[PDB]
Amino acid sequence: MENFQKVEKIGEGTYGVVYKARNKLTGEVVALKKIRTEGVPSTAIREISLLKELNHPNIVKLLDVIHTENKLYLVFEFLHQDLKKFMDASALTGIPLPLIKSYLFQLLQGLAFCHSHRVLHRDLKPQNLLINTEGAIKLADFGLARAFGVPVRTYTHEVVTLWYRAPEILLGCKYYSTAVDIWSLGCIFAEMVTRRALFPGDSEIDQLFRIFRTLGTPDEVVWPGVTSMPDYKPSFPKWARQDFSKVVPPLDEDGRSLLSQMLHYDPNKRISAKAALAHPFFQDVTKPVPHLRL
Numbered sequence: 001m002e003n004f005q006k007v008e009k010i011g012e013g014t015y016g017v018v019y020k021a022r023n024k025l026t027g028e029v030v031a032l033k034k035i036r037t038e039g040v041p042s043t044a045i046r047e048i049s050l051l052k053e054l055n056h057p058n059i060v061k062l063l064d065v066i067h068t069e070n071k072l073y074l075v076f077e078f079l080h081q082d083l084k085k086f087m088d089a090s091a092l093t094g095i096p097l098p099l100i101k102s103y104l105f106q107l108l109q110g111l112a113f114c115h116s117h118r119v120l121h122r123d124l125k126p127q128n129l130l131i132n133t134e135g136a137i138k139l140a141d142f143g144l145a146r147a148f149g150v151p152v153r154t155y156t157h158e159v160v161t162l163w164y165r166a167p168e169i170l171l172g173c174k175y176y177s178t179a180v181d182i183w184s185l186g187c188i189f190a191e192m193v194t195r196r197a198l199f200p201g202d203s204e205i206d207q208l209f210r211i212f213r214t215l216g217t218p219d220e221v222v223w224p225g226v227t228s229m230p231d232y233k234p235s236f237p238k239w240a241r242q243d244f245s246k247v248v249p250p251l252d253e254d255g256r257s258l259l260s261q262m263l264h265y266d267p268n269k270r271i272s273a274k275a276a277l278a279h280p281f282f283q284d285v286t287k288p289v290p291h292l293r294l
């Protein structure tokens with residue numbers, strides 16, 4: 001970029017590439033997302049405007065939006081590490097529970113905020129959760145599928161992670177609800193706790209069946225309407241629900257209770273971000289600072 005000096009490539013998003021860059025003029029360091037194409041939508045460029053006026057301490061700030069040369073650049077505030085790297089770095093010892101709780105609490109605040117402003121993330125995963133030396137964690141790279149929908153992959157032949165995708169999406173639901181983000185966050189919560197992905201599916205069906213084998217194949221009793229969903233098949237195997245205590249050991253009962261509500265099959269029974277913030281699990285929440293190696 002003529003105005004920006006690419007320090008280095010820091011990620012391959014589901015829409016474009018992300019670079020750490022410095023503003024040649026101001027000298028500020030930012031994250032620059034490059035988007036692919038011969039026109040550019042409108043319902044999207046305006047869905048983006050909404051995201052710019054979306055300011056909250058737990059949401060990565062979208063500084064600028066620049067459309068030029070059949071390219072779409074998104075300028076974001078820069079953070080030094082994502083949760084995927086931090087979990088890997090903490091794989092031997094595990095992230096301490098108070099930090100896990102603080103991170104979950106903050107992300108729920110972020111979600112409560114975007115959801116009350118009718119904004120959905122749609123693609124929450126460790127790679128889209130950024131942390132700093134101050135103990136904060138922020139939601140990054142919002143989906144924006146309401147317009148730009150969901151591309152076959154990311155942008156250039158790349159395996160899109162399905163591990164955090166809600167069951168209703170896998171079953172062909174056309175309209176997503178804020179509940180999809182709660183499910184993804186629940187999956188991440190479990191992963192921080194156990195240090196292993198909850199549902200590591202390698203295909204859409206494998207993803208779906210991994211969920212079924214653990215939470216039990218859903219039926220009309222626990223999920224009214226499930227059998228009438230677009231991709232539901234009566235031929236789905238019928239797995240029994242596994243004891244929840246085997247799921248995220250050795251998480252305490254307050255933690256397991258909160259997770260079970262974040263993982264309810266029925267989107268309408270799934271706990272909201274606002275209600276989750278009030279769960280007894282957060283009675284003793286604090287804000288520890290992580291040990292970050294940058």
Ligand SMILES: Nc1nc(Nc2ccc(S(N)(=O)=O)cc2)sc1C(=O)c1cccc([N+](=O)[O-])c1
Nearest residue numbers: 013018031033076077078079080081082085141
């Ligand atoms: N602002 C920002 N800072 C970042 N800093 C960063 C610093 C360190 C690491 S890492 N992996 O070395 O810990 C990763 C990101 S990433 C980032 C993003 O807004 C972003 C995140 C995921 C996907 C996309 N996207 O456009 O597709 C963009």
